[PDB]
């Protein structure tokens, strides 16, 4: 479950 | 954290007060059971001999493998001052406290005890019908007044005063109501044994001028008493203490003789399930529990829809979770309650998924989750929604005559840990309101 990671893109 | 909590409180007590505390055999016996198993072994060896043993000898008993446990045991005993290290003749001799040694000796050998364990009136009462009902209801009432559910008979001022000033159930006059806090939910989560000590430990700190040892003396021997028996009446401070004890549902009085209850015995570290509920993908809760206390605690973060005699059925909703989050309950705590109050069926299906997961690929062994991961993700995501905006109060600095001055002022703020944000291009930095004076003070200096 990936809720604590950073965002996606760039 | 039961033995840690009781032990830690004892350590903070001054040694001068501890010596008087060990006067009664009853409290010494209770304190003896709190030390680690290795500490008890050494204490039992030293109680029955009126001699001096060098320190190294006790070390010889411990095997090489268990050497680590020796350090913890000796440290715990020394902190309580039960063990007195005496150095003479070039050797560090070890001896036991004379008061503690005598206190333990009397209890084991049945010596003069000065009625520390109490007396028997031979006037017993039915434990199941009266003692269990009275304490259960009295402890039930205080819990309901803490979880916020309406209840007719509010608790007395004594316990009410203790709850407020403590971290439990923060109250505000302007709001005119009482609500649970982050520690309050943890207090509910903690088992009955730890639940009782938290209130008692807070009360011990609340009392002022009532002697600290006397209150500790009464509490320890209370557990020594056996439920369903009479006990005639004690110190003057212990009298008002005994009446206050009734407020917490630990002792029952008709109006000369006091009867301990199940909670009283449980105090001294005594050794489908009710409350189990089903959490599924549809955010529907089916708690197989029949008790107002369980229902009340569930409603803190569950939108109840109906109730049957056998169980209560409800639904998790965004509104319900936000309500608990606003009060101060953390999401990690909520999942802990869900996990620790799971239905046996959920574990089996989760294990079946694990078994199939191992069958396909046994190289991965992740910690099994009783309830579906989707509920965990949504609950935590809602917590992130409430933490969407983060704001700090303080002041801003700008228009620095020289870059060196800006760096010097900013560097000091970082050193004292009061610098929040800074930008070199704008030569600006924001500091917390708490450390605003410190930064300003350094600016003058």
């Amino acid at each position: 479950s990936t809720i604590g990671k950073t965002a996606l893109g760039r | 954290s039961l033995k840690h909590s009781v032990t830690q409180y004892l350590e903070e007590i001054p040694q001068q007060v501890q010596n008087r505390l060990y006067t009664s055999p009853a409290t010494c016996l209770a304190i003896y059971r709190i030390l680690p198993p290795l500490a008890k072994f050494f204490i039992m060896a030293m109680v029955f001999n009126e001699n001096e043993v060098p320190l190294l000898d006790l070390d010889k008993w411990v095997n090489s493998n268990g050497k680590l446990q020796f350090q913890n045991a000796i440290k715990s005993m020394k902190s309580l001052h039960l063990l007195i290290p005496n150095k003479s003749s070039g050797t560090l001799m070890i001896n036991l406290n004379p008061t503690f040694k005598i206190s333990l000796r009397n209890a084991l050998t049945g010596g003069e005890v000065q009625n520390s364990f109490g007396v028997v009136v031979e006037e017993n009462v039915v434990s199941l019908d009266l003692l269990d009902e009275y304490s259960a209801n009295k402890w039930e009432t205080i819990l309901h007044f803490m979880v916020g559910t309406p209840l007719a008979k509010i608790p007395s001022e004594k316990v009410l005063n203790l709850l407020k000033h403590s971290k439990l159930m923060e109250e505000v006059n302007s709001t005119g109501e009482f609500k649970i806090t982050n520690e309050g939910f943890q207090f509910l989560l903690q088992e009955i044994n730890s639940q009782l000590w938290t209130l008692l430990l807070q009360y011990l700190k609340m009392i002022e001028t009532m002697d600290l040892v006397d209150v500790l003396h009464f509490i320890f021997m209370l557990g020594a008493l056996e439920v369903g028996k009479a006990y005639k009446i004690l110190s003057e401070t212990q009298r008002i203490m005994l009446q206050d004890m009734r407020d917490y549902g630990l002792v029952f009085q008709k109006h000369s003789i006091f009867y301990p209850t199940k909670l009283a015995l449980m105090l001294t570290s005594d050794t489908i399930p009710d409350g189990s509920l089903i959490v599924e993908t549809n955010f529907k809760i089916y708690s197989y529990s029949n008790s107002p206390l369980q229902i009340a605690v569930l409603s803190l973060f569950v939108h109840l829809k109906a109730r049957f005699v056998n169980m209560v059925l409800g639904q998790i909703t965004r509104e319900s979770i936000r309500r608990a989050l606003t009060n101060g309950i953390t999401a990690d705590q909520i999942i802990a309650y869900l996990e620790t109050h799971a239905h046996p069926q959920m574990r089996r299906l989760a294990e079946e998924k694990l078994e199939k997961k191992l069958e396909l690929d046994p190289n991965c062994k992740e910690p099994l989750q009783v309830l579906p991961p989707t509920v965990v993700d949504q609950i935590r995501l809602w917590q992130l929604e409430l933490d969407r905006v983060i704001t700090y109060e303080g002041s801003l600095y700008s228009d620095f005559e020289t870059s060196q001055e800006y760096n010097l002022l900013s560097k000091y703020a970082q050193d004292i840990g009061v610098l929040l944000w800074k930008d070199d291009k704008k030569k600006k930095f924001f500091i917390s309101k708490e450390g605003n004076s410190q930064v300003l003070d350094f600016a003058k200096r």
């Binding site: - | 909703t317 965004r318 969407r388 905006v389 983060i390 704001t391 700090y392 109060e393 303080g394 002041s395 801003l396 600095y397 700008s398 228009d399 620095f400 929040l420 944000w421 930008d423 600006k428 924001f430 605003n436 300003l440 600016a443």
Partner: protein, 65 residues
Amino acid sequence: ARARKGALVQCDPSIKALILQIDAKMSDIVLEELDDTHLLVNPSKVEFVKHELNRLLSKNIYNPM
């Protein structure tokens, strides 16, 4: 070196637009702009803006009934 009372608001680029848009209609909301992810706002308006932001953000979140 003037202590301009304000709330140090840290926000993601998406939220940053909301505060700018909120400040557009209500000029008094935002005192000054710090950076892309940082802002300084009127301390009094902090209570109002937070509730106001929730109402706007509440719309894009569905409610079962």
